[PDB]
């Protein structure tokens, strides 16, 4: 299974960063808070490889943590789940972990497990990243892949 390493930044220039051990937040870096964005390991998994759609899995480089979509309090919710390093990424994986990466010049990440739910950020700084179902309103659903390198 082919993987890559990148950071993600919404369309408003908010970089994804770590909150505590089990949550992400978004805030404008560069000249405010310096350059360290979470490094994701994006794997090319199996599913419908539509037109501009590629099924991927988003993992926290070196944490053995994956983003997953689960129902909590009856709403599709983003959680970071533990996985066994022996078994992951590898595979063609479970649904809760698959996101359809939709290309536009920006990217959207739709929950494969919950069609029409997207990885979203608020307009406000330092807020948690979440699964949102509007794609219009004040929450951001568009991102760019950032180089980290080394």
Contacts for 83 with CB less than 8 Å, ≥ 6 apart: 59, 64, 65, 66
> Is beta strand 40-44 parallel, antiparallel or unpaired with respect to 75-82?
unpaired
Domain 1-150: give its CATH code. 2.80.10.50
Alpha-carbon radius of gyration of the chain: 14
Burial, 144: exposed, middle or buried (Cβ in 10 Å; 0-12, 13-18, 19+)?
middle
**Resolution to one decimal, Å:** 2.4
For residues 31 and 39, the answer to whether their CB atoms sit within 8 Å is no
- Minimal CA–CA distance to 57: which of 44, 48, 70? 44
Which technique was the structure solved with, according to the deposited record?
X-ray
């Amino acid at each position: 299974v082919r993987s890559l390493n990148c950071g993600l930044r919404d369309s408003q220039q908010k970089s994804l960063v770590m909150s505590g051990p089990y949550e992400l937040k978004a805030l404008h870096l560069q000249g405010q808070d310096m350059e360290q964005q979470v490094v994701f390991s994006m794997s090319f998994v199996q599913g419908e490889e539509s037109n501009d759609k590629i099924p991927v899995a988003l993992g926290l480089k070196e944490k053995n943590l994956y983003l997953s979509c689960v129902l909590k309090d009856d709403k599709p919710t983003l959680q970071l789940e533990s996985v066994d390093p022996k078994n992951y990424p590898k595979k063609k994986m479970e649904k809760r972990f698959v996101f359809n990466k939709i290309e536009i010049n920006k990217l959207e990440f739709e929950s494969a497990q919950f069609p029409n739910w997207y990885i979203s950020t608020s307009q406000a700084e330092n807020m948690p990243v979440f699964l949102g179902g509007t794609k219009g309103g004040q929450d951001i659903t568009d991102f760019t892949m950032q180089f980290v390198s080394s």
